[PDB]
Amino acid sequence: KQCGVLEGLKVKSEWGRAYGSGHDREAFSQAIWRATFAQVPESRSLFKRVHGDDTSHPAFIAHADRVLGGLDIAISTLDQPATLKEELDHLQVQHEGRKIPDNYFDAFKTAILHVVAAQLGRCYDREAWDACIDHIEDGIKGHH
């Protein structure tokens, strides 16, 4: 149920195998979002500034890499509880300036799980992953 400092590095290893090199990454991004929007149709309104109407437009592709790019930093360091809280706290002020219900990034949680499972080599522990990214979710929300 907690980050379980051993289990913390479990996902740290798995994530490396899933989030890969090459242009598949750009494809690995598309999956997550195409999954998310199908759960919450009206969440696209929040992206009017990034051309989030259609998801295949080049301006949007850029947006999604930064998202993974950002999330890579998070999972990269669960070893140092200091630097995480520093780096993570940065993301708070990013989202804080607009209205994100606690319903959405519960669904974006469900989205990453499924996509990872497919992309990954048939073996991973859900309840291990479930905890760690949820710790990050408690982070950006700003309060637990």
């Binding site: 379980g4 400092v5 051993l6 289990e7 590095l9 479990k10 290893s13 798995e14 070893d79 073996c123 991973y124 522990d125 291990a128």
Partner: protein, 147 residues
């Protein structure tokens, strides 16, 4: 009970997942959690290892202990495709444990479980049965001539 063969290939992959790096950040944190799990069931052993300043969990020294345990343990595994060089290096590693006091034959059979209770939480695909079988024939050959 018969290390067999396929069990060894089973190991060589399992061990390659935990050991893969040129940095020591990971190899440390894993093995430290082995003993940290050991001492919870045999607090008497903790009275030993006083030479290394055990009392400090994060010492500038204590790491320099566990690090040599790994590189010693990893030294075993990379011999399994070539035996007869194991015995020699096995017998050596045995004698380094009889020259001190407070090493009980009961302690080894304990840590056999210590990996099994907490070795996987690091990996995903893992064979408990294999790792448990070929590990005794390593340890049951250390405690032979020791009390």
């Amino acid at each position: 009970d018969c290390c067999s063969y396929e069990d060894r290939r089973e190991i060589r992959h399992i061990w390659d997942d935990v050991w893969s790096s040129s940095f020591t950040d990971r190899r440390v944190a894993i093995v430290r959690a082995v003993f940290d799990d050991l001492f919870k069931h045999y607090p008497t052993s903790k009275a030993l290892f006083e030479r290394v300043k055990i009392d400090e969990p994060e010492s500038g020294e204590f790491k320099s202990h566990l690090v040599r345990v790994a590189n010693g343990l990893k030294l075993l595994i990379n011999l399994l495709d070539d035996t007869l060089v194991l015995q020699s290096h096995l017998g050596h590693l045995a004698d380094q444990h009889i020259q001190r006091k407070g090493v009980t034959k009961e302690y080894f059979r304990g840590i056999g479980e210590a990996f099994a209770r907490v070795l996987p939480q690091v990996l995903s695909c893992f064979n408990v049965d294999a790792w448990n079988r070929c590990f005794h024939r390593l340890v049951a050959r250390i405690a032979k001539d020791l009390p």
